[PDB]
Homo-oligomer: A and B are copies of this chain.
């Protein structure tokens, strides 16, 4: 199954020119708890920002341009991309926008982090039909000694 996992600011902003202006170690811990021992499919921009292969997950970069790290697989198409990961129960799309638009249609579940942060964006999370999705998990939290904005984690399943 294909799942999408994203941190969204107010208005569905998922990326900037630069790093987002939030420090959410809890958002990372949720990110990891849900991506571990799973194949993660990302684009190049995001790969350039993670800094390295993610530990304990099969890194897959979806891109028309190639062959830079030895430590991740390099796929050129979604179709290929899907296979490169395999016969797995669930594949994780970790963005950015472009990969998001393309995997959506196939998406059966969404893992979202709603961050209360107003940012002028560059990329956005495609527009999903809130009618098409069902919320099966929700959990709100306030900013604290380590998290700079309040956030809410949610899981949607395609209706």
On A, residues with C-beta under 8 Å from B are 16-23, 45, 48-49, 51, 117, 143-149
Residues of B within 8 A of A21 (CB): 21-23, 117, 148-149
A89 → B minimal CB distance (Å):
31
Name the residue of chain B whose CB is nearest to the CB of A18: B143
Name the residue of chain B whose CB is nearest to the CB of A150: B18
* Oligomer copy total: 2
Question: What's the Cα separation between A118 and B39 when bound, in Å?
Answer: 38
Question: What's the Cα separation between A16 and B146 when bound, in Å?
Answer: 11
Residues of B within 8 A of A145 (CB): 17-19, 45, 48-49, 51
Name the residue of chain B whose CB is nearest to the CB of A22: B21
Name the residue of chain B whose CB is nearest to the CB of A23: B19
A99 → B minimal CB distance (Å):
16
Can you show 8 pairs from A to B with CB atoms below 8 A apart?
A16-B148, A18-B144, A18-B145, A19-B143, A19-B144, A19-B148, A21-B23, A45-B145
Tell whether, in the assembled complex, residue B149 and residue A18 are in contact, meaning their CB atoms are under 8 Å apart: yes
Question: What's the Cα separation between A45 and B146 when bound, in Å?
Answer: 11
Name the residue of chain B whose CB is nearest to the CB of A144: B18
Residues of B within 8 A of A143 (CB): 17-19
Partner of A19, one of B18, B20, B45, B146: B146
Known: A21-B23, A45-B145. 7 other contacts (CB 8 A): A17-B145, A18-B143, A18-B144, A19-B145, A21-B21, A22-B23, A51-B145
